[PDB]
Structures are given as C-alpha cells and as structure tokens.
Short mmCIF file of the N, C-alpha and C atoms (twelve columns), coordinates in Angstrom:
data_MODEL
# 
_entry.id   MODEL 
# 
loop_
_atom_site.group_PDB 
_atom_site.id 
_atom_site.type_symbol 
_atom_site.label_atom_id 
_atom_site.label_alt_id 
_atom_site.label_comp_id 
_atom_site.label_asym_id 
_atom_site.label_seq_id 
_atom_site.Cartn_x 
_atom_site.Cartn_y 
_atom_site.Cartn_z 
_atom_site.pdbx_PDB_model_num 
ATOM 1   N N  . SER A 1   -5.730  -23.415 -21.935 1 
ATOM 2   C CA . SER A 1   -6.842  -22.933 -22.725 1 
ATOM 3   C C  . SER A 1   -6.612  -21.520 -23.110 1 
ATOM 4   N N  . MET A 2   -7.279  -21.088 -24.156 1 
ATOM 5   C CA . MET A 2   -7.214  -19.731 -24.525 1 
ATOM 6   C C  . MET A 2   -7.859  -18.804 -23.494 1 
ATOM 7   N N  . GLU A 3   -8.938  -19.265 -22.842 1 
ATOM 8   C CA . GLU A 3   -9.634  -18.463 -21.809 1 
ATOM 9   C C  . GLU A 3   -8.618  -18.135 -20.627 1 
ATOM 10  N N  . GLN A 4   -7.856  -19.166 -20.241 1 
ATOM 11  C CA . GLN A 4   -6.813  -19.011 -19.166 1 
ATOM 12  C C  . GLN A 4   -5.781  -18.012 -19.552 1 
ATOM 13  N N  . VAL A 5   -5.292  -18.071 -20.783 1 
ATOM 14  C CA . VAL A 5   -4.405  -17.009 -21.289 1 
ATOM 15  C C  . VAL A 5   -4.983  -15.604 -21.264 1 
ATOM 16  N N  . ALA A 6   -6.272  -15.507 -21.647 1 
ATOM 17  C CA . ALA A 6   -6.894  -14.168 -21.686 1 
ATOM 18  C C  . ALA A 6   -6.992  -13.588 -20.271 1 
ATOM 19  N N  . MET A 7   -7.303  -14.481 -19.331 1 
ATOM 20  C CA . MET A 7   -7.412  -14.098 -17.902 1 
ATOM 21  C C  . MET A 7   -6.036  -13.690 -17.411 1 
ATOM 22  N N  . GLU A 8   -5.027  -14.440 -17.836 1 
ATOM 23  C CA . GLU A 8   -3.638  -14.070 -17.471 1 
ATOM 24  C C  . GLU A 8   -3.173  -12.733 -18.062 1 
ATOM 25  N N  . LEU A 9   -3.605  -12.418 -19.280 1 
ATOM 26  C CA . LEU A 9   -3.275  -11.138 -19.870 1 
ATOM 27  C C  . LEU A 9   -3.924  -9.951  -19.084 1 
ATOM 28  N N  . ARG A 10  -5.163  -10.143 -18.667 1 
ATOM 29  C CA . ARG A 10  -5.947  -9.173  -17.822 1 
ATOM 30  C C  . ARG A 10  -5.162  -8.943  -16.526 1 
ATOM 31  N N  . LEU A 11  -4.732  -10.021 -15.888 1 
ATOM 32  C CA . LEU A 11  -3.919  -9.906  -14.627 1 
ATOM 33  C C  . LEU A 11  -2.628  -9.167  -14.865 1 
ATOM 34  N N  . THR A 12  -1.941  -9.434  -15.976 1 
ATOM 35  C CA . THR A 12  -0.766  -8.724  -16.315 1 
ATOM 36  C C  . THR A 12  -0.978  -7.274  -16.522 1 
ATOM 37  N N  . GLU A 13  -2.041  -6.918  -17.225 1 
ATOM 38  C CA . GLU A 13  -2.343  -5.522  -17.432 1 
ATOM 39  C C  . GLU A 13  -2.763  -4.833  -16.087 1 
ATOM 40  N N  . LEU A 14  -3.487  -5.526  -15.258 1 
ATOM 41  C CA . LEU A 14  -3.819  -4.921  -13.912 1 
ATOM 42  C C  . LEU A 14  -2.528  -4.651  -13.157 1 
ATOM 43  N N  . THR A 15  -1.595  -5.627  -13.216 1 
ATOM 44  C CA . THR A 15  -0.292  -5.504  -12.570 1 
ATOM 45  C C  . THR A 15  0.436   -4.293  -13.072 1 
ATOM 46  N N  . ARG A 16  0.431   -4.020  -14.408 1 
ATOM 47  C CA . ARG A 16  1.006   -2.781  -14.953 1 
ATOM 48  C C  . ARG A 16  0.392   -1.543  -14.359 1 
ATOM 49  N N  . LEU A 17  -0.909  -1.534  -14.266 1 
ATOM 50  C CA . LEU A 17  -1.600  -0.329  -13.785 1 
ATOM 51  C C  . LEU A 17  -1.297  -0.135  -12.278 1 
ATOM 52  N N  . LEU A 18  -1.369  -1.218  -11.500 1 
ATOM 53  C CA . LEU A 18  -1.023  -1.179  -10.040 1 
ATOM 54  C C  . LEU A 18  0.421   -0.785  -9.802  1 
ATOM 55  N N  . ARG A 19  1.359   -1.162  -10.702 1 
ATOM 56  C CA . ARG A 19  2.730   -0.664  -10.539 1 
ATOM 57  C C  . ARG A 19  2.796   0.836   -10.689 1 
ATOM 58  N N  . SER A 20  2.101   1.425   -11.664 1 
ATOM 59  C CA . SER A 20  2.080   2.859   -11.818 1 
ATOM 60  C C  . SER A 20  1.389   3.542   -10.559 1 
ATOM 61  N N  . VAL A 21  0.282   2.951   -10.098 1 
ATOM 62  C CA . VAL A 21  -0.378  3.445   -8.856  1 
ATOM 63  C C  . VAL A 21  0.598   3.396   -7.684  1 
ATOM 64  N N  . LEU A 22  1.323   2.296   -7.535  1 
ATOM 65  C CA . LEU A 22  2.227   2.121   -6.406  1 
ATOM 66  C C  . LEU A 22  3.312   3.185   -6.455  1 
ATOM 67  N N  . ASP A 23  3.822   3.477   -7.670  1 
ATOM 68  C CA . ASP A 23  4.838   4.497   -7.798  1 
ATOM 69  C C  . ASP A 23  4.371   5.840   -7.433  1 
ATOM 70  N N  . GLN A 24  3.171   6.185   -7.838  1 
ATOM 71  C CA . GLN A 24  2.579   7.456   -7.532  1 
ATOM 72  C C  . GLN A 24  2.330   7.588   -6.009  1 
ATOM 73  N N  . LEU A 25  1.871   6.522   -5.370  1 
ATOM 74  C CA . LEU A 25  1.585   6.607   -3.898  1 
ATOM 75  C C  . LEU A 25  2.893   6.743   -3.154  1 
ATOM 76  N N  . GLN A 26  3.927   6.024   -3.548  1 
ATOM 77  C CA . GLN A 26  5.157   6.066   -2.854  1 
ATOM 78  C C  . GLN A 26  5.856   7.433   -2.998  1 
ATOM 79  N N  . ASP A 27  5.586   8.111   -4.099  1 
ATOM 80  C CA . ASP A 27  6.061   9.507   -4.215  1 
ATOM 81  C C  . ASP A 27  5.491   10.446  -3.178  1 
ATOM 82  N N  . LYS A 28  4.314   10.147  -2.648  1 
ATOM 83  C CA . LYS A 28  3.706   10.894  -1.593  1 
ATOM 84  C C  . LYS A 28  4.297   10.628  -0.213  1 
ATOM 85  N N  . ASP A 29  5.378   9.858   -0.206  1 
ATOM 86  C CA . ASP A 29  6.141   9.490   1.054   1 
ATOM 87  C C  . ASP A 29  7.568   9.830   0.813   1 
ATOM 88  N N  . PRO A 30  7.832   11.161  0.686   1 
ATOM 89  C CA . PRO A 30  9.230   11.451  0.320   1 
ATOM 90  C C  . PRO A 30  10.270  11.183  1.430   1 
ATOM 91  N N  . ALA A 31  9.794   11.128  2.688   1 
ATOM 92  C CA . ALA A 31  10.660  10.796  3.799   1 
ATOM 93  C C  . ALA A 31  11.051  9.277   3.849   1 
ATOM 94  N N  . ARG A 32  10.400  8.456   2.994   1 
ATOM 95  C CA . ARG A 32  10.623  7.012   2.995   1 
ATOM 96  C C  . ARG A 32  10.303  6.326   4.335   1 
ATOM 97  N N  . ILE A 33  9.345   6.914   5.048   1 
ATOM 98  C CA . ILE A 33  8.870   6.348   6.301   1 
ATOM 99  C C  . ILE A 33  8.214   4.988   6.156   1 
ATOM 100 N N  . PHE A 34  7.575   4.783   4.993   1 
ATOM 101 C CA . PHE A 34  6.799   3.522   4.753   1 
ATOM 102 C C  . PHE A 34  7.464   2.598   3.736   1 
ATOM 103 N N  . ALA A 35  8.697   2.886   3.365   1 
ATOM 104 C CA . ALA A 35  9.409   2.144   2.385   1 
ATOM 105 C C  . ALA A 35  9.726   0.730   2.691   1 
ATOM 106 N N  . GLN A 36  10.008  0.413   3.966   1 
ATOM 107 C CA . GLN A 36  10.446  -0.896  4.381   1 
ATOM 108 C C  . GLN A 36  9.655   -1.414  5.621   1 
ATOM 109 N N  . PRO A 37  9.674   -2.712  5.878   1 
ATOM 110 C CA . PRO A 37  9.050   -3.204  7.120   1 
ATOM 111 C C  . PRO A 37  9.602   -2.650  8.358   1 
ATOM 112 N N  . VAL A 38  8.753   -2.342  9.326   1 
ATOM 113 C CA . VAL A 38  9.213   -2.026  10.661  1 
ATOM 114 C C  . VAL A 38  10.150  -3.148  11.131  1 
ATOM 115 N N  . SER A 39  11.360  -2.758  11.540  1 
ATOM 116 C CA . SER A 39  12.353  -3.731  12.024  1 
ATOM 117 C C  . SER A 39  12.077  -4.302  13.453  1 
ATOM 118 N N  . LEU A 40  11.982  -5.621  13.604  1 
ATOM 119 C CA . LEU A 40  11.685  -6.226  14.861  1 
ATOM 120 C C  . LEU A 40  12.925  -6.244  15.694  1 
ATOM 121 N N  . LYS A 41  14.107  -6.081  15.075  1 
ATOM 122 C CA . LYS A 41  15.297  -5.819  15.910  1 
ATOM 123 C C  . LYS A 41  15.191  -4.482  16.612  1 
ATOM 124 N N  . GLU A 42  14.784  -3.419  15.899  1 
ATOM 125 C CA . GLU A 42  14.631  -2.059  16.460  1 
ATOM 126 C C  . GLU A 42  13.308  -1.732  17.243  1 
ATOM 127 N N  . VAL A 43  12.238  -2.464  16.905  1 
ATOM 128 C CA . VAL A 43  10.961  -2.319  17.609  1 
ATOM 129 C C  . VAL A 43  10.500  -3.717  17.995  1 
ATOM 130 N N  . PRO A 44  11.139  -4.309  19.052  1 
ATOM 131 C CA . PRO A 44  10.899  -5.710  19.353  1 
ATOM 132 C C  . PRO A 44  9.489   -6.104  19.777  1 
ATOM 133 N N  . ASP A 45  8.740   -5.151  20.312  1 
ATOM 134 C CA . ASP A 45  7.339   -5.395  20.703  1 
ATOM 135 C C  . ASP A 45  6.344   -5.200  19.526  1 
ATOM 136 N N  . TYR A 46  6.829   -4.905  18.312  1 
ATOM 137 C CA . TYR A 46  5.854   -4.419  17.287  1 
ATOM 138 C C  . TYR A 46  4.654   -5.371  17.082  1 
ATOM 139 N N  . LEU A 47  4.917   -6.669  17.006  1 
ATOM 140 C CA . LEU A 47  3.890   -7.620  16.638  1 
ATOM 141 C C  . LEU A 47  2.915   -7.866  17.803  1 
ATOM 142 N N  . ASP A 48  3.243   -7.362  18.993  1 
ATOM 143 C CA . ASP A 48  2.262   -7.360  20.060  1 
ATOM 144 C C  . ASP A 48  1.176   -6.308  19.791  1 
ATOM 145 N N  . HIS A 49  1.533   -5.259  19.050  1 
ATOM 146 C CA . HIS A 49  0.652   -4.141  18.757  1 
ATOM 147 C C  . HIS A 49  -0.054  -4.369  17.412  1 
ATOM 148 N N  . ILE A 50  0.706   -4.678  16.402  1 
ATOM 149 C CA . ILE A 50  0.244   -4.672  15.001  1 
ATOM 150 C C  . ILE A 50  0.271   -6.126  14.466  1 
ATOM 151 N N  . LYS A 51  -0.929  -6.583  14.155  1 
ATOM 152 C CA . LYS A 51  -1.030  -7.991  13.792  1 
ATOM 153 C C  . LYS A 51  -0.722  -8.290  12.327  1 
ATOM 154 N N  . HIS A 52  -0.877  -7.284  11.416  1 
ATOM 155 C CA . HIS A 52  -0.629  -7.478  10.008  1 
ATOM 156 C C  . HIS A 52  0.236   -6.243  9.522   1 
ATOM 157 N N  . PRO A 53  1.531   -6.310  9.789   1 
ATOM 158 C CA . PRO A 53  2.463   -5.267  9.277   1 
ATOM 159 C C  . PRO A 53  2.456   -5.171  7.761   1 
ATOM 160 N N  . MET A 54  2.694   -3.961  7.261   1 
ATOM 161 C CA . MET A 54  2.709   -3.779  5.818   1 
ATOM 162 C C  . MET A 54  3.653   -2.600  5.533   1 
ATOM 163 N N  . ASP A 55  4.150   -2.562  4.321   1 
ATOM 164 C CA . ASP A 55  5.085   -1.521  3.864   1 
ATOM 165 C C  . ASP A 55  5.183   -1.565  2.320   1 
ATOM 166 N N  . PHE A 56  5.762   -0.540  1.719   1 
ATOM 167 C CA . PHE A 56  5.791   -0.491  0.277   1 
ATOM 168 C C  . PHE A 56  6.670   -1.606  -0.357  1 
ATOM 169 N N  . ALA A 57  7.789   -1.992  0.276   1 
ATOM 170 C CA . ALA A 57  8.604   -3.051  -0.289  1 
ATOM 171 C C  . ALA A 57  7.881   -4.385  -0.356  1 
ATOM 172 N N  . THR A 58  7.117   -4.672  0.683   1 
ATOM 173 C CA . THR A 58  6.355   -5.893  0.796   1 
ATOM 174 C C  . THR A 58  5.259   -5.855  -0.281  1 
ATOM 175 N N  . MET A 59  4.614   -4.695  -0.488  1 
ATOM 176 C CA . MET A 59  3.584   -4.619  -1.534  1 
ATOM 177 C C  . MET A 59  4.225   -4.850  -2.922  1 
ATOM 178 N N  . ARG A 60  5.426   -4.327  -3.110  1 
ATOM 179 C CA . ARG A 60  6.082   -4.418  -4.404  1 
ATOM 180 C C  . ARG A 60  6.426   -5.884  -4.700  1 
ATOM 181 N N  . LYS A 61  6.862   -6.636  -3.687  1 
ATOM 182 C CA . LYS A 61  7.111   -8.120  -3.828  1 
ATOM 183 C C  . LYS A 61  5.822   -8.861  -4.251  1 
ATOM 184 N N  . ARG A 62  4.734   -8.562  -3.577  1 
ATOM 185 C CA . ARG A 62  3.437   -9.131  -3.957  1 
ATOM 186 C C  . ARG A 62  3.031   -8.739  -5.387  1 
ATOM 187 N N  . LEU A 63  3.183   -7.498  -5.736  1 
ATOM 188 C CA . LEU A 63  2.798   -7.015  -7.042  1 
ATOM 189 C C  . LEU A 63  3.581   -7.724  -8.138  1 
ATOM 190 N N  . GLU A 64  4.888   -7.855  -7.943  1 
ATOM 191 C CA . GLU A 64  5.742   -8.455  -8.988  1 
ATOM 192 C C  . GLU A 64  5.538   -9.958  -9.170  1 
ATOM 193 N N  . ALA A 65  4.957   -10.627 -8.195  1 
ATOM 194 C CA . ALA A 65  4.491   -11.968 -8.311  1 
ATOM 195 C C  . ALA A 65  3.051   -12.019 -8.879  1 
ATOM 196 N N  . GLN A 66  2.577   -10.894 -9.437  1 
ATOM 197 C CA . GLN A 66  1.130   -10.788 -9.783  1 
ATOM 198 C C  . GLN A 66  0.163   -11.284 -8.732  1 
ATOM 199 N N  . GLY A 67  0.422   -10.911 -7.460  1 
ATOM 200 C CA . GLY A 67  -0.340  -11.338 -6.367  1 
ATOM 201 C C  . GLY A 67  -1.557  -10.508 -5.948  1 
ATOM 202 N N  . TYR A 68  -1.820  -9.425  -6.675  1 
ATOM 203 C CA . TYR A 68  -3.058  -8.666  -6.468  1 
ATOM 204 C C  . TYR A 68  -4.073  -9.017  -7.612  1 
ATOM 205 N N  . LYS A 69  -5.143  -9.637  -7.223  1 
ATOM 206 C CA . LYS A 69  -6.161  -10.065 -8.272  1 
ATOM 207 C C  . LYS A 69  -7.075  -8.945  -8.691  1 
ATOM 208 N N  . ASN A 70  -7.238  -7.936  -7.825  1 
ATOM 209 C CA . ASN A 70  -8.116  -6.824  -8.102  1 
ATOM 210 C C  . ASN A 70  -7.601  -5.592  -7.310  1 
ATOM 211 N N  . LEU A 71  -8.130  -4.439  -7.628  1 
ATOM 212 C CA . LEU A 71  -7.740  -3.193  -6.925  1 
ATOM 213 C C  . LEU A 71  -8.073  -3.224  -5.428  1 
ATOM 214 N N  . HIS A 72  -9.171  -3.830  -5.020  1 
ATOM 215 C CA . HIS A 72  -9.570  -3.905  -3.605  1 
ATOM 216 C C  . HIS A 72  -8.445  -4.524  -2.752  1 
ATOM 217 N N  . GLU A 73  -7.863  -5.605  -3.240  1 
ATOM 218 C CA . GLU A 73  -6.737  -6.284  -2.529  1 
ATOM 219 C C  . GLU A 73  -5.524  -5.355  -2.323  1 
ATOM 220 N N  . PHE A 74  -5.185  -4.601  -3.344  1 
ATOM 221 C CA . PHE A 74  -4.106  -3.633  -3.324  1 
ATOM 222 C C  . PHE A 74  -4.433  -2.519  -2.349  1 
ATOM 223 N N  . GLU A 75  -5.623  -1.971  -2.467  1 
ATOM 224 C CA . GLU A 75  -6.042  -0.936  -1.468  1 
ATOM 225 C C  . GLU A 75  -6.020  -1.422  -0.042  1 
ATOM 226 N N  . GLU A 76  -6.399  -2.669  0.195   1 
ATOM 227 C CA . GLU A 76  -6.337  -3.253  1.553   1 
ATOM 228 C C  . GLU A 76  -4.931  -3.121  2.167   1 
ATOM 229 N N  . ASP A 77  -3.930  -3.464  1.360   1 
ATOM 230 C CA . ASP A 77  -2.524  -3.436  1.795   1 
ATOM 231 C C  . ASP A 77  -2.120  -1.975  2.028   1 
ATOM 232 N N  . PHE A 78  -2.498  -1.064  1.103   1 
ATOM 233 C CA . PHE A 78  -2.150  0.358   1.323   1 
ATOM 234 C C  . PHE A 78  -2.783  0.925   2.607   1 
ATOM 235 N N  . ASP A 79  -4.019  0.560   2.844   1 
ATOM 236 C CA . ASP A 79  -4.690  1.019   4.063   1 
ATOM 237 C C  . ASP A 79  -4.028  0.457   5.314   1 
ATOM 238 N N  . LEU A 80  -3.467  -0.747  5.287   1 
ATOM 239 C CA . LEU A 80  -2.710  -1.305  6.384   1 
ATOM 240 C C  . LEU A 80  -1.501  -0.482  6.748   1 
ATOM 241 N N  . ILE A 81  -0.815  -0.017  5.723   1 
ATOM 242 C CA . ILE A 81  0.368   0.865   5.977   1 
ATOM 243 C C  . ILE A 81  -0.019  2.037   6.817   1 
ATOM 244 N N  . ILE A 82  -1.093  2.700   6.411   1 
ATOM 245 C CA . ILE A 82  -1.552  3.926   7.050   1 
ATOM 246 C C  . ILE A 82  -2.124  3.614   8.422   1 
ATOM 247 N N  . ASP A 83  -3.060  2.641   8.434   1 
ATOM 248 C CA . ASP A 83  -3.773  2.387   9.666   1 
ATOM 249 C C  . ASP A 83  -2.884  1.824   10.781  1 
ATOM 250 N N  . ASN A 84  -1.901  1.021   10.460  1 
ATOM 251 C CA . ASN A 84  -0.941  0.405   11.432  1 
ATOM 252 C C  . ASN A 84  -0.171  1.588   12.061  1 
ATOM 253 N N  . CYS A 85  0.284   2.512   11.218  1 
ATOM 254 C CA . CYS A 85  1.106   3.665   11.723  1 
ATOM 255 C C  . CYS A 85  0.286   4.537   12.622  1 
ATOM 256 N N  . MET A 86  -0.971  4.807   12.271  1 
ATOM 257 C CA . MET A 86  -1.817  5.696   13.063  1 
ATOM 258 C C  . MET A 86  -2.235  5.054   14.402  1 
ATOM 259 N N  . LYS A 87  -2.122  3.743   14.529  1 
ATOM 260 C CA . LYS A 87  -2.353  3.081   15.828  1 
ATOM 261 C C  . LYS A 87  -1.069  3.066   16.690  1 
ATOM 262 N N  . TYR A 88  0.045   2.671   16.107  1 
ATOM 263 C CA . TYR A 88  1.287   2.501   16.877  1 
ATOM 264 C C  . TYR A 88  1.883   3.806   17.334  1 
ATOM 265 N N  . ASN A 89  1.725   4.836   16.500  1 
ATOM 266 C CA . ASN A 89  2.306   6.137   16.777  1 
ATOM 267 C C  . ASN A 89  1.299   7.138   17.232  1 
ATOM 268 N N  . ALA A 90  1.635   8.046   18.136  1 
ATOM 269 C CA . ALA A 90  0.726   9.094   18.594  1 
ATOM 270 C C  . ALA A 90  0.550   10.181  17.605  1 
ATOM 271 N N  . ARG A 91  -0.556  10.916  17.733  1 
ATOM 272 C CA . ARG A 91  -0.841  12.131  16.901  1 
ATOM 273 C C  . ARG A 91  0.225   13.166  16.704  1 
ATOM 274 N N  . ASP A 92  1.048   13.374  17.728  1 
ATOM 275 C CA . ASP A 92  2.073   14.400  17.752  1 
ATOM 276 C C  . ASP A 92  3.404   13.956  17.111  1 
ATOM 277 N N  . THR A 93  3.401   12.857  16.374  1 
ATOM 278 C CA . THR A 93  4.662   12.322  15.880  1 
ATOM 279 C C  . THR A 93  4.780   12.528  14.419  1 
ATOM 280 N N  . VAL A 94  6.041   12.583  13.943  1 
ATOM 281 C CA . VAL A 94  6.272   12.701  12.502  1 
ATOM 282 C C  . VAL A 94  5.739   11.491  11.742  1 
ATOM 283 N N  . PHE A 95  5.734   10.303  12.380  1 
ATOM 284 C CA . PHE A 95  5.211   9.106   11.735  1 
ATOM 285 C C  . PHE A 95  3.735   9.195   11.479  1 
ATOM 286 N N  . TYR A 96  2.964   9.528   12.518  1 
ATOM 287 C CA . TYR A 96  1.484   9.651   12.331  1 
ATOM 288 C C  . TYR A 96  1.156   10.675  11.284  1 
ATOM 289 N N  . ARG A 97  1.850   11.829  11.408  1 
ATOM 290 C CA . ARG A 97  1.543   12.930  10.482  1 
ATOM 291 C C  . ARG A 97  1.862   12.541  9.032   1 
ATOM 292 N N  . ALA A 98  2.920   11.764  8.846   1 
ATOM 293 C CA . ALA A 98  3.321   11.280  7.481   1 
ATOM 294 C C  . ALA A 98  2.188   10.398  6.929   1 
ATOM 295 N N  . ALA A 99  1.649   9.563   7.794   1 
ATOM 296 C CA . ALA A 99  0.559   8.685   7.390   1 
ATOM 297 C C  . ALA A 99  -0.679  9.478   6.996   1 
ATOM 298 N N  . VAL A 100 -1.046  10.515  7.757   1 
ATOM 299 C CA . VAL A 100 -2.183  11.319  7.393   1 
ATOM 300 C C  . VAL A 100 -1.985  11.917  5.973   1 
ATOM 301 N N  . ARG A 101 -0.813  12.505  5.750   1 
ATOM 302 C CA . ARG A 101 -0.530  13.165  4.502   1 
ATOM 303 C C  . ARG A 101 -0.535  12.153  3.334   1 
ATOM 304 N N  . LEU A 102 -0.001  10.964  3.589   1 
ATOM 305 C CA . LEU A 102 -0.041  9.865   2.595   1 
ATOM 306 C C  . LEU A 102 -1.453  9.419   2.273   1 
ATOM 307 N N  . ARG A 103 -2.325  9.258   3.289   1 
ATOM 308 C CA . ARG A 103 -3.704  8.919   3.092   1 
ATOM 309 C C  . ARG A 103 -4.419  9.997   2.226   1 
ATOM 310 N N  . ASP A 104 -4.207  11.241  2.576   1 
ATOM 311 C CA . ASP A 104 -4.941  12.334  1.912   1 
ATOM 312 C C  . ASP A 104 -4.513  12.492  0.464   1 
ATOM 313 N N  . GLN A 105 -3.210  12.440  0.214   1 
ATOM 314 C CA . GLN A 105 -2.682  12.538  -1.119  1 
ATOM 315 C C  . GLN A 105 -2.954  11.307  -1.941  1 
ATOM 316 N N  . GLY A 106 -2.944  10.146  -1.325  1 
ATOM 317 C CA . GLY A 106 -3.128  8.885   -2.050  1 
ATOM 318 C C  . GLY A 106 -4.577  8.708   -2.494  1 
ATOM 319 N N  . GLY A 107 -5.513  9.305   -1.757  1 
ATOM 320 C CA . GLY A 107 -6.951  9.205   -2.058  1 
ATOM 321 C C  . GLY A 107 -7.245  9.644   -3.474  1 
ATOM 322 N N  . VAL A 108 -6.585  10.726  -3.886  1 
ATOM 323 C CA . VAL A 108 -6.736  11.309  -5.218  1 
ATOM 324 C C  . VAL A 108 -6.327  10.294  -6.325  1 
ATOM 325 N N  . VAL A 109 -5.189  9.642   -6.098  1 
ATOM 326 C CA . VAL A 109 -4.574  8.707   -7.030  1 
ATOM 327 C C  . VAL A 109 -5.493  7.481   -7.131  1 
ATOM 328 N N  . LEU A 110 -5.924  7.001   -5.975  1 
ATOM 329 C CA . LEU A 110 -6.775  5.816   -5.933  1 
ATOM 330 C C  . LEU A 110 -8.171  6.034   -6.523  1 
ATOM 331 N N  . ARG A 111 -8.688  7.236   -6.381  1 
ATOM 332 C CA . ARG A 111 -9.989  7.583   -6.952  1 
ATOM 333 C C  . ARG A 111 -9.960  7.410   -8.486  1 
ATOM 334 N N  . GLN A 112 -8.888  7.847   -9.162  1 
ATOM 335 C CA . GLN A 112 -8.824  7.724   -10.611 1 
ATOM 336 C C  . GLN A 112 -8.413  6.289   -11.025 1 
ATOM 337 N N  . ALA A 113 -7.606  5.597   -10.216 1 
ATOM 338 C CA . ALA A 113 -7.278  4.224   -10.452 1 
ATOM 339 C C  . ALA A 113 -8.520  3.369   -10.537 1 
ATOM 340 N N  . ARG A 114 -9.471  3.602   -9.650  1 
ATOM 341 C CA . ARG A 114 -10.707 2.814   -9.639  1 
ATOM 342 C C  . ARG A 114 -11.504 3.068   -10.933 1 
ATOM 343 N N  . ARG A 115 -11.600 4.311   -11.337 1 
ATOM 344 C CA . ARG A 115 -12.259 4.613   -12.617 1 
ATOM 345 C C  . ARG A 115 -11.563 3.869   -13.764 1 
ATOM 346 N N  . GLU A 116 -10.217 3.864   -13.807 1 
ATOM 347 C CA . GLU A 116 -9.434  3.189   -14.886 1 
ATOM 348 C C  . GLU A 116 -9.597  1.667   -14.893 1 
ATOM 349 N N  . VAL A 117 -9.617  1.096   -13.699 1 
ATOM 350 C CA . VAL A 117 -9.803  -0.336  -13.590 1 
ATOM 351 C C  . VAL A 117 -11.166 -0.749  -14.115 1 
ATOM 352 N N  . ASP A 118 -12.210 -0.038  -13.700 1 
ATOM 353 C CA . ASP A 118 -13.601 -0.238  -14.187 1 
ATOM 354 C C  . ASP A 118 -13.749 0.051   -15.689 1 
ATOM 355 N N  . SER A 119 -13.236 1.200   -16.106 1 
ATOM 356 C CA . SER A 119 -13.284 1.608   -17.515 1 
ATOM 357 C C  . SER A 119 -12.639 0.564   -18.471 1 
ATOM 358 N N  . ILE A 120 -11.335 0.278   -18.301 1 
ATOM 359 C CA . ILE A 120 -10.607 -0.718  -19.141 1 
ATOM 360 C C  . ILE A 120 -11.090 -2.162  -18.882 1 
ATOM 361 N N  . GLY A 121 -11.701 -2.404  -17.719 1 
ATOM 362 C CA . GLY A 121 -12.183 -3.732  -17.315 1 
ATOM 363 C C  . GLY A 121 -11.039 -4.495  -16.678 1 
# 
C-alpha cells in the first residue's frame, strides 16, 4: 500500500537522523571505551553483573537494520551503555568517569534530537 511506503519513508528518515545522533554521541567517547561489547573472554563474569549489555557497535547494527522505531528506543540503548558501566565499575575508575562525561555531553545532543524528531514528525 501507499500508506506502508509512507511509513517506511518516515522510518528511513528517522534512521538518517539517528545515524547523525549516533555519530555525535560517539564523538564524545574519544577513548573508544564504549565502542565495542565487553568481551566475555576478558571479563568472564560480566553477565552475572549486567543483564543487558550494550555498546556503540551493537547500536549501529540495530540502526542499520532500521531497528529503532522511535527516539525513545534509541535513548534506551544509549542509557544502557552508561548505566551498565556506572554499575560494573567504581567511581574512581577511568571507565566510570568516561561514562559520566558521555552522559553529560550526550544530554545536549539528545535534547535537540528530540526537538527535531517532534518538529519534522
């Protein structure tokens, strides 16, 4: 149907906007601490601690499959990156501190993303 196509075009355009958001957030992680999944070879107990691991590569796979239907879903995954790190790692670590800085810097980007998503529809 034409309605299905129009809905698909909306999803495609959201995907474009979320790719630009993802790029901007990942720039706020210049150490590449959140770039890839925590390795279960290197941290064998991880899944005893963290029930829903997340990382930027995994988000990018989801995004390229047009797997985010709305901004809330995308933000959920970004918050997992931050929140998982702040639980597994202590306050005094470079990992926790990287997550704080990513959260604070990313807030700015996400605040305008939400306006754009609402504005363009």
